[PDB]
From a paper:
Here we investigate the role of histone demethylases in plant flowering through the analysis of Arabidopsis JMJ13, which we show possesses H3K27me3 site-specific demethylase activity in vitro and in vivo. JMJ13 has a central catalytic domain flanked by flexible regions on both N- and C-termini. Our genetic studies suggest that JMJ13 acts as a flowering repressor, which modulates flowering time in a temperature- and photoperiod-dependent manner.
The crystal structure of the JMJ13 catalytic domain (JMJ13CD), including the predicted jumonji, helical, and zinc finger domains, in complex with the co-factor α-ketoglutarate (α-KG), was determined to 2.4 Å resolution. Despite being in different subfamilies, the overall structure of JMJ13CD resembles the previously reported structures of human KDM5A/B/C and Arabidopsis JMJ14, which are composed of two parts: the jumonji domain and the helical plus zinc finger domains. The jumonji domain adopts a typical α-KG-dependent oxygenase fold with a double-stranded β-helix in the center surrounded by several α-helices. The helical domain consists of four long α-helices forming a helical bundle. However, our structural analysis showed that the predicted C5HC2 zinc finger of JMJ13 in fact adopts a C4HCHC arrangement, which is composed of a CCCH-type zinc finger (Cys500, Cys503, Cys522, and His525) and a CCHC-type zinc finger (Cys514, Cys516, His519, and Cys534). Rather than the predicted Cys507, the His525 contributes to zinc coordination in the C4HCHC-type zinc finger domain in JMJ13. Although the C4HCHC zinc finger domain is embedded in the primary sequence of the helical domain, structurally it forms an independent domain that interacts with the helical domain in a similar manner to the helical and C5HC2 domains of JMJ1424.
Residue numbers in the entry: 93 to 564
């Protein structure tokens, strides 16, 4: 009946001055104790661009064009073949012609293309989902390119809140990656129209996401605190099963997949089960941040262009760990080299003791403790596993490991410190598997690849072990 739409509590909205703006990771660390309780927050930029998004796309790039995907409005009404077809049924557009198409579609629905009040279009979207006749909507996700100006005078484009600079920021955990990952080491452009949506979900590897709106109509977000994630999933599993949420029967599988088979469902279903939901209505010039493991969904109120990138800081490491477990449980290759990030950050902290002790913030210090704790646990397990491996006598070979991260052939967990290699190089395994029970077609000789500086890292671990707050 849609009363809920305007009784939904709104997420925190921050309005820093220029001098407080700093870089987004430092700023997030200052506001984290409050904002992280909500899962989502909004930050009004105190910096305006000099060259607006359309002028960047038309003047600072050559013949910018993009291809859309076709998104069904009611996901559960379609089988798995129709979804494939939908993805590739898009069309190539200029920025301008996509704008005009969206405006003419909007005007055909509402007799005028003028932006309508936020409450009106929110109710319109949910009533369309529930009983509308529009089948699909066109949008351009995951487009590569940026609308931040590269011009030197641009206050926004030359700031650290230019999302192309985020992943290399000093507090960005993923600054340590040597490989590129779209959406993760680089932002991506999103171009939407009326009712184009992002269904309920959590980022890969439980990363943060930060999203800037460059221009166009409002964008409504619903966010779930990270602390409610499990509850969210529990409730969704019940409501899909009672057919409170429309989908195809789950037939087990994994929540990540079942979610992909549900028609987007309104926050009232979750409110009725006492999981908190907070609303953000984002307009050009505002950033929206979602926190690790914070479920979020939303939709566009008309033509709009935004830009997003995912990231991590120290405080993310406990969440990454949980994600790695799920990745391993589902037998899926993780997105990030978790072990390698732990070890690199930890050795950086072990290397310097005076930059960190003197001026640290609480969230930064907690992230440092999370890194040190993850590192200590990793080194301990590896030490015990190596001791057992040695005593068994089933791994005669030993090689100094100078590779990057490798993927385990059985559980697909990332291996940075150590792996057990086979006689043919195609069946390496992490150190969690019983060597005696490996039946490999290449033979039975097993070689431990062990990172060259393992002793330095054990010493760093033993020293972190004794520090206050590193409690294991
Ligand atoms: O821009 C969008 O529509 C997707 C936003 C999102 O899912 C994110 O930034 O995490
Ligand atoms: Ni997202
Ligand atoms: Zn494994
Ligand atoms: Zn082999």
């Amino acid at each position: 009946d849609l009363k809920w739409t305007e009784r939904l509590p709104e997420c925190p909205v921050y309005r820093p001055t220029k001098e407080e703006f700093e870089d987004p990771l430092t700023y997030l660390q200052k506001i984290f104790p409050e904002a992280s309780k909500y899962g989502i927050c909004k930050i009004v930029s105190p910096l305006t661009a000099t060259v607006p998004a359309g002028a960047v796309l038309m003047k600072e790039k050559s013949n910018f064009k993009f291809t859309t995907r076709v998104q069904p409005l009611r996901l559960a009404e379609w089988d798995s073949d129709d979804k494939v077809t939908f993805f590739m049924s898009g069309r190539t557009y200029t920025f301008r012609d996509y704008e005009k198409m969206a405006n003419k579609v909007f005007a055909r629905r509402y007799c005028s293309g003028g932006s309508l009040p936020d409450s009106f279009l929110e109710k319109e979207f949910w009533k369309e989902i529930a009983c509308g006749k529009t089948e699909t909507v066109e949008y351009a996700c995951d487009v590569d390119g940026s609308a931040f100006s590269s011009a030197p005078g641009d206050p926004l484009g030359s700031s650290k809140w230019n999302l192309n600079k985020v992943s290399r920021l000093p507090k960005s955990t993923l600054r340590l990656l040597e490989t590129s990952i779209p959406g993760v080491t680089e932002p991506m452009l999103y171009i939407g129209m009326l009712f184009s949506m992002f269904a309920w979900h959590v980022e890969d590897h439980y990363l943060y996401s930060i999203n800037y709106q460059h221009c166009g109509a409002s964008k409504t977000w619903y966010g779930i605190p990270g602390s409610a994630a499990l509850k969210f999933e529990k409730v969704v599993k019940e409501c899909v099963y009672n057919d409170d949420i429309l989908s195809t029967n789950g037939e087990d599988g994994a929540f990540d997949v079942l979610l992909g088979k549900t028609t987007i469902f309104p926050p009232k279903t979750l409110l009725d089960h006492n999981v908190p939901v907070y609303k953000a209505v984002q307009k050009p010039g505002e950033f929206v941040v979602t926190f690790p493991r914070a479920y979020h969904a939303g939709f566009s109120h008309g033509f709009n262009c935004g830009e997003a990138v995912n990231f991590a800081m120290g405080d993310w490491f406990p969440f990454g760990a949980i994600a790695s477990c799920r990745y391993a449980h589902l037998n899926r290759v993780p997105l990030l080299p978790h072990e390698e990030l732990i070890c690199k950050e930890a050795m950086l902290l072990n290397s310097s003791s005076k930059s960190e002790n003197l001026d640290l913030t609480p969230t930064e210090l907690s992230g440092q403790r999370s890194i040190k704790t993850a590192f200590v646990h990793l080194i301990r397990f590896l030490h015990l596993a190596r001791w057992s491996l040695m005593k068994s006598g089933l791994c005669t070979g030993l090689v100094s490991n100078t590779y990057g991260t490798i993927v385990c052939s059985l559980c697909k967990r990332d291996c940075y410190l150590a792996f057990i290699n086979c006689e043919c190089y195609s069946h390496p395994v992490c150190l969690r598997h019983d060597v005696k029970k490996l039946d490999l077609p290449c033979g039975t000789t097993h070689t431990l690849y062990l990172r060259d500086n393992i002793e330095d890292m054990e010493a760093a671990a033993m020293k972190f072990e004794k520090e206050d707050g590193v409690s294991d």
